[PDB]
Every structure is written in C-alpha cells, then in structure tokens.
Amino acid sequence: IPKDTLIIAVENEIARINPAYSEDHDAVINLVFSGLTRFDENMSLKPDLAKSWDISKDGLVYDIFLRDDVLWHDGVKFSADDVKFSIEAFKNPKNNSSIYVNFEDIKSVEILNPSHVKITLFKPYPAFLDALSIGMLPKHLLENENLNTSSFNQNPIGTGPYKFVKWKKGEYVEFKANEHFYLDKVKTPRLIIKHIFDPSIASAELKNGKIDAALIDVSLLNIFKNDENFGILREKSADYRALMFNLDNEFLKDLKVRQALNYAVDKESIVKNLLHDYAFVANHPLERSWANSKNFKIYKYDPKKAEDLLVSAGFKKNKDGNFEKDGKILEFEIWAMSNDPLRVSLAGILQSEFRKIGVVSKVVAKPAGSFDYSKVDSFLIGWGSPLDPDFHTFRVFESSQDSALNDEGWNFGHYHDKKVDIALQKARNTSNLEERKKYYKDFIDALYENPPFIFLAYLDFALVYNKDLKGIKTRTLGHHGVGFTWNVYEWSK
Numbered sequence: 001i002p003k004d005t006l007i008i009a010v011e012n013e014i015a016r017i018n019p020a021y022s023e024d025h026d027a028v029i030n031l032v033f034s035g036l037t038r039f040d041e042n043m044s045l046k047p048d049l050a051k052s053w054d055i056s057k058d059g060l061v062y063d064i065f066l067r068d069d070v071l072w073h074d075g076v077k078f079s080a081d082d083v084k085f086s087i088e089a090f091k092n093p094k095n096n097s098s099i100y101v102n103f104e105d106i107k108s109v110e111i112l113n114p115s116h117v118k119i120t121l122f123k124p125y126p127a128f129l130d131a132l133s134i135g136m137l138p139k140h141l142l143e144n145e146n147l148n149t150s151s152f153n154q155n156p157i158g159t160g161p162y163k164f165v166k167w168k169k170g171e172y173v174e175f176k177a178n179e180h181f182y183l184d185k186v187k188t189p190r191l192i193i194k195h196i197f198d199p200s201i202a203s204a205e206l207k208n209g210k211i212d213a214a215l216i217d218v219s220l221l222n223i224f225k226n227d228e229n230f231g232i233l234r235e236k237s238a239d240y241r242a243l244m245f246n247l248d249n250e251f252l253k254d255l256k257v258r259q260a261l262n263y264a265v266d267k268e269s270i271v272k273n274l275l276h277d278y279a280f281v282a283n284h285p286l287e288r289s290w291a292n293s294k295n296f297k298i299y300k301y302d303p304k305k306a307e308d309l310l311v312s313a314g315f316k317k318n319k320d321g322n323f324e325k326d327g328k329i330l331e332f333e334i335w336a337m338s339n340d341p342l343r344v345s346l347a348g349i350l351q352s353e354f355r356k357i358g359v360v361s362k363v364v365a366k367p368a369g370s371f372d373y374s375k376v377d378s379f380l381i382g383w384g385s386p387l388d389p390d391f392h393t394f395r396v397f398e399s400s401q402d403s404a405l406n407d408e409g410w411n412f413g414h415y416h417d418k419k420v421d422i423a424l425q426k427a428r429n430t431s432n433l434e435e436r437k438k439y440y441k442d443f444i445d446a447l448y449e450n451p452p453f454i455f456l457a458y459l460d461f462a463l464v465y466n467k468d469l470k471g472i473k474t475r476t477l478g479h480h481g482v483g484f485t486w487n488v489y490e491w492s493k
C-alpha cells in the first residue's frame with residue numbers, strides 16, 4: 001500500500017451514504033459529511049459547522065451561528081440554507097429518516113442571515129446538540145429529489161474531511177482528501193473503506209498488507225503478538241452484548257420465564273473465560289453513561305432461583321428433566337451472526353446454561369444479513385452509544401419503536417412496557433440534568449422488573465494498525481466499535 005493511501009476495514013456497510021439514514025452502523029457518513037457539532041478525544045461537545053450557539057433559558061430556542069468558510073465537495077458554499085433544508089428533511093416523515101426521533105420535537109427553523117439559524121422546539125430536547133453532529137445535507141442537490149431513493153445516496157456530496165470517489169458494492173468505498181477542509185488539513189490523500197465482516201479474513205489481509213488497520217476480535221488478537229508491522233490499541237466502548245427476547249414467542253412473552261432465564265447465566269464466568277477481561281459484566285444499557293444510577297438491582301447467577309421461578313410460572317418437569325407446560329416443552333431458538341465468533345460463542349454458552357436448568361434451546365448460526373432477527377425466538381444482540389443516553393435507548397426500547405410497527409424502529413424484540421415508555425420520553429424532554437438522571441433511573445429500574453434482554457457484557461475493542469501510521473487517537477467507542485475512525489483525517493504514514 002502506497003504512503004498516500006489509507007486502507008481500513010469495517011464490518012458494517014450501508015446502502016445509502018446519507019446522514020438522514022444513519023443507524024450508527026457505519027464509518028463512511030462521518031467521512032463525507034460534517035454536522036454543526038462534533039466530539040473530541042474526551043467525547044466533549046465541540047463546534048464543527050457551527051462556530052457557536054446560544055440556548056434559551058427554557059431550552060426551547062436554539063440560536064446557531066455558522067462558519068462562513070465552508071465549502072461543499074462540489075465547490076458550492078455551505079450556508080444557512082443547507083441547515084434549514086437538512087433539519088426539515090430529517091423531520092419530514094415522508095423521508096423515513098432513521099434519525100427522525102432526534103428531530104421530532106422541532107417547531108420551526110428560521111434563517112435570520114446566511115450565517116445565523118434559529119431553531120425553536122415544542123418541548124425541551126437536551127440531546128439536540130449531540131443530534132446535530134450527524135451531518136448536514138446540500139440543499140442545491142437534494143431540494144427537488146426524493147431523499148429516500150435519490151442517486152445522491154450512492155454519489156454523496158458533503159462537507160466532511162473526505163470526498164466520495166467511487167463505490168464497489170460489497171467490496172470497498174474509495175475517498176480522496178477534501179482539499180478545502182476548514183477544520184484541519186486532511187493528511188492522507190487517499191482513503192479506502194474496505195468491507196470485511198469476517199474477522200479471520202480481516203486478520204489475514206492485515207498480515208498480507210492489503211489493509212492498514214481494522215478492529216480485530218479479541219479471540220484473534222494473539223495472532224498479532226510479536227508481529228512488528230502492527231501496533232495494538234485497546235479501546236473502551238459503550239457497546240454491550242445481550243440476548244434479545246422476542247416477546248411474540250409463546251414462552252418468552254411470560255415475565256417469569258425471562259426472569260428465570262436471567263438467573264441461569266454466570267456472566268462473570270463468561271467475561272473471564274470467553275473475553276479474557278477485555279470486558280465487564282453488563283446489567284443494563286447505560287453503564288458507561290452519566291445517566292447510570294449506580295444503584296440498581298441485578299439478576300444474580302442462581303440456577304435454583306431460576307428453576308423455582310419456572311415452576312411458579314406453571315411449568316412441570318418431565319421424565320427427561322426438561323420443563324413442560326400444558327403438554328408443550330419450553331423450547332425456543334437462539335440466533336447468532338455466524339460471522340461474529342463472540343456472538344456464536346456467547347449463544348453456545350447461553351444454551352448450556354439454559355439446559356442445566358432444564359430449558360431446551362437450539363443455537364442457529366447464520367451470516368449477518370441472511371435472516372430477519374426481529375422474527376426469531378431470541379437473538380444475540382448488541383447496542384450502545386457514548387453520546388446522549390437517549391440515542392440507543394429510545395429507538396431500542398420505547399414501544400412506538402417496535403420494528404414490526406415502525407420501519408425505522410430498533411425495537412426488534414417487540415418490547416412494550418408502559419414505565420419504560422414514560423421514563424424515556426420524560427428523560428429526553430427534561431432540561432435539568434439531575435431530573436434526567438432520575439428518569440433514566442426509573443428506566444433502568446423498569447428494565448429490571450420487566451427484562452427485554454439478558455444483558456451480558458460491555459466490550460472493549462482492539463484496533464490493529466500499520467505501525468507506520470501517525471496521528472491515531474483513541475476514545476470511547478460506540479456499537480460495533482463505530483467511531484474508531486473519528487480523527488482519520490489526522491492519520492498519516
């Protein structure tokens with residue numbers, strides 16, 4: 001690989017390179033686009049396209065002041081027009097934006113002058129500044145387009161550090177440095193995002209020198225020991241793994257069953273042995289957040305509590321020593337993405353724990369994208385954001401976000417809890433920080449009393465990189481390790 005070219009592998013690919021359809025599962029949107037705000041090495045809110053902002057006392061009015069030295073990749077200037085268009089596009093239900101929920105509380109967007117936009121809200125939404133980091137859209141290209149289907153989505157123009165060059169689908173996306181980047185000089189002139197979902201192949205291509213960097217599963221990490229072409233950077237993350245219950249399932253809809261299944265698992269055993277202390281035991285989805293109550297009940301590893309719960313639910317043990325109810329065995333499937341060894345291994349351990357308490361389960365391992373995980377009995381799932389606590393909680397747990405009911409929802413297990421709904425809505429619409437913490441405490445407590453998941457472990461990630469690489473900075477990563485390329489414009493060899 002030439003010195004003026006950077007090649008990075010990422011596991012997840014997106015169909016539309018457009019902030020409006022961002023699902024925190026990609027690395028290319030933050031390359032092409034830039035938002036009004038951004039985050040530094042410490043996850044602190046920093047100015048990006050917006051040079052500064054003022055927020056009204058009641059949190060309903062945002063005055064945003066824009067930089068005037070920003071160009072779109074087509075040489076067209078960034079202005080307040082783009083901001084009004086972008087935000088109005090996110091809000092428009094006809095665009096089916098994946099980030100619609102972050103913009104739904106917006107009343108109006110006013111252009112006061114070409115560098116000053118005034119945003120008014122129906123209700124407070126303190127995550128708004130975090131939400132505005134997502135990336136602005138070019139008005140002059142998309143004004144007369146169908147955002148859902150526009151060819152723009154496969155030929156994007158943004159204000160980010162990198163320009164779109166060409167896209168080989170299922171292969172790679174190539175970028176070139178934005179010569180007019182306002183924030184900083186983009187160091188490496190060529191950037192290739194290579195799509196590799198198989199970690200063994202990712203490891204092999206590193207050894208081959210076909211790619212410069214990738215996130216490598218901990219089980220494969222020992223392979224790069226003694227290798228001198230590579231350094232290893234350990235990164236913390238808000239990413240957790242869990243078992244998603246499908247509450248449509250005849251057995252998993254029952255509360256007593258889900259509580260019993262939580263009692264059956266020795267998460268410390270899992271973390272210690274399977275993850276080699278590259279993790280810690282998870283109990284709820286906000287344990288890296290300020291919203292963490294650090295004062296919550298847990299389901300502690302206790303098989304007889306588990307078995308006793310199942311009897312209470314009305315299950316009788318049979319001659320095989322497996323629970324049955326009204327003539328039918330307590331049986332369901334555990335699906336895992338076969339391309340993710342950690343998930344397959346976790347599903348395998350879960351199956352073994354469940355049998356020891358007389359629950360029959362079947363592990364189904366299929367490649368990511370080959371099946372609909374919102375229709376399987378249970379699924380080894382993952383989520384987690386280092387940003388506002390609302391971002392991977394509302395779409396994931398709130399009942400209106402049921403994916404069967406909402407095409408842009410992330411509630412794949414069809415979970416419906418009234419207390420979760422109220423707590424998340426009030427938390428996302430409350431300005432006071434301490435009051436927010438109280439509502440997220442309610443949320444966590446509500447999750448305990450009616451578990452949608454079996455929370456398992458928060459993950460650390462390992463970045464394996466060409467040792468010739470300069471300028472890499474670590475920070476708290478999100479789900480799938482998204483964000484490890486956050487400062488890639490500083491990268492050079």
Ligand SMILES: N[C@@H](Cc1c[nH]c[nH+]1)C(=O)O
Nearest residue numbers: 025368380381382383479
């Ligand atoms: N984010 C969820 C769903 C998903 C499927 N593929 C990628 N993500 C998970 O990681 O389990």
Ligand SMILES: [Mg+2]
Nearest residue numbers: 030034035038
């Ligand atoms: Mg950005």
Ligand code: NI
Nearest residue numbers: 025382479480
């Ligand atoms: Ni995911």
